[PDB]
Symmetry: C3
Subunit: 223 residues, 3 copies
């Protein structure tokens, strides 16, 4: 079950890599090339992640459980690129882009600490990591969206959809974590693997396609 879902991750991400890579090579202009290149590397990184986990790398027994700590290594590299999908389309300001990137990095590092420390101290870091996540939620839902809407007055719904899908998908990660054996142990590592793999596929391949469609919608509103 765990192995099966890791190999689904390998294949889904490698497929996503292939599509965005071809997309980058055939891109119309620099803006399409930028957005395809972003999503190509997001999926390539995740494909390497899933390859490593499937082959038994980046996993050690922590708190009595085999723990796939390597997810934080690759998430640290791929999730800023996802946030750059948003700020590239929104044409977000410099300080707001750095705030998104900074908050995200803080979230992952303190989430990594939560994952490798024993209970109950791990809950302290979980709370700190969630607080950094809540900052991201506020930044995307208010200043990022408002500015993006002012700059794309005809496409306001496009950005509302982008942020909605983003926060729906990302919010499920700490829910999976807290319900997993890291917290309340309401399901097994096998199901935990399934949930993170579903989320990763939706938030990288799925969201990657949404970002491309969002750019088409932005172009069509100024044709």
């Amino acid at each position: 079950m765990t192995q099966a879902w890791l190999w689904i991750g390998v294949i889904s991400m490698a497929l996503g890599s292939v599509f965005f890579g071809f997309g980058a090579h055939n891109a119309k202009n620099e803006r399409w090339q930028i957005l395809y290149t972003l999503n190509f590397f997001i999926c390539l990184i995740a494909a390497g992640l899933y390859l490593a986990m499937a082959l038994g790398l980046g996993v050690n027994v922590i708190n009595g459980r085999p723990t796939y700590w390597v997810r934080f290594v690759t998430w640290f590299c791929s999730t800023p690129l996802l946030l750059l999908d948003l700020t590239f389309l929104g044409r977000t300001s410099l300080p707001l882009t750095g705030s998104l990137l900074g908050a995200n990095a803080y979230m992952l590092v303190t989430g990594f600490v939560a994952t490798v420390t024993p209970k109950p101290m791990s809950y302290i870091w979980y709370i700190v990591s969630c607080a950094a996540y809540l900052a991201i939620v506020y930044l995307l839902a208010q200043p990022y969206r408002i500015a993006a809407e002012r700059k794309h007055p005809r496409s306001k719904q496009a950005f509302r959809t982008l942020v909605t899908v983003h926060l729906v998908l990302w919010t499920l990660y700490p829910i999976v974590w807290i319900l997993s054996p890291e917290g309340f142990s309401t399901f097994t590592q096998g199901s935990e693997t399934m949930f993170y793999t579903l989320l990763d596929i939706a938030s990288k391949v799925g969201f990657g396609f949404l970002s491309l469609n969002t750019l088409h919608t932005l172009e069509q509103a100024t044709e």
Copy 2:
């Protein structure tokens, strides 16, 4: 004593985070937003550092002593942001900004090597790290200051003060290190903790306020 000073660090940095965070949310324009955001993340990172150390994380017995090696992890992230305070206010050129950032990173990595290696080889890395620090001192005191002064002809003293406080504070770190049990063992880990915590508070919260006042002085000289 060590625990007391670590908790003073937690509180001081978390307070500093709160002030700059509010400052960033209320900032007048993009320039104030940039500088508050820089100082917010400097203090937030240090608050995470002190939280981790206070809870017994990032410390292992090295050379027979409990050693808070995690300081190098977070210093690596927060001190480039401090240097960006200076180059943002000075409007420093691209190569000079990279030189400051590069020299700083080199200083911390070789300082980390000095801290985890045994004597006398540790002294070799201490000397290399100090050499990288001396490059920073020269870069700030001569090309950074001279260029900054040419661009702010009415505020030359503002930058002289910025650089003076910076180099006074940063020079005390290798002095603390060499006098600590890492070198001549003239004081205990408890006092060592006190000195690094005082320095960190002065060079992050204190210097952060100075940087904000420096920007006000720069604005007032062109009103």
Copy 3:
């Protein structure tokens, strides 16, 4: 033999650092200052690498062999600066520069995995790392060169030479790796050390001088 070649590395890189550092301090304009600063840090990083290896740091017994894994730490920092030599001279676009940097980082991380895993699984990562290298080869030999040539119509041969020397030197690294005890064991660690040291000196000090001469050639074609 291993120690001798590590000390040759220390000296060659430290010499290279000194020349580019002086060059940066005396640079004519910002463009010369940028290119000297790039090459100064490339050589300074490699000098720290060779100092650490010569003193017995960054080497652990992996797969029954002492293995200088630290090379990947410093290569990760210095090789993007080499690629920036190329994109600075070519005035390469943003997505193409990120693609070069991204592919390079992927190459080194999966190459690091190949180096620390046992056979035959290490061959899987070797193949993945080479695939990332082949992407670099294609990106430099086609889109990077073509764009660079369109922007420097009078200096097309300069860029052809730059890319040729680059790919000749970089291709020798995976050949050394696969023929070393990491692969077919056709030569000893002593010779392996000699080859990586020769390559590092050619691809950093040597290529650094080529990059400077290339800039002179670019300037002379518009005098």
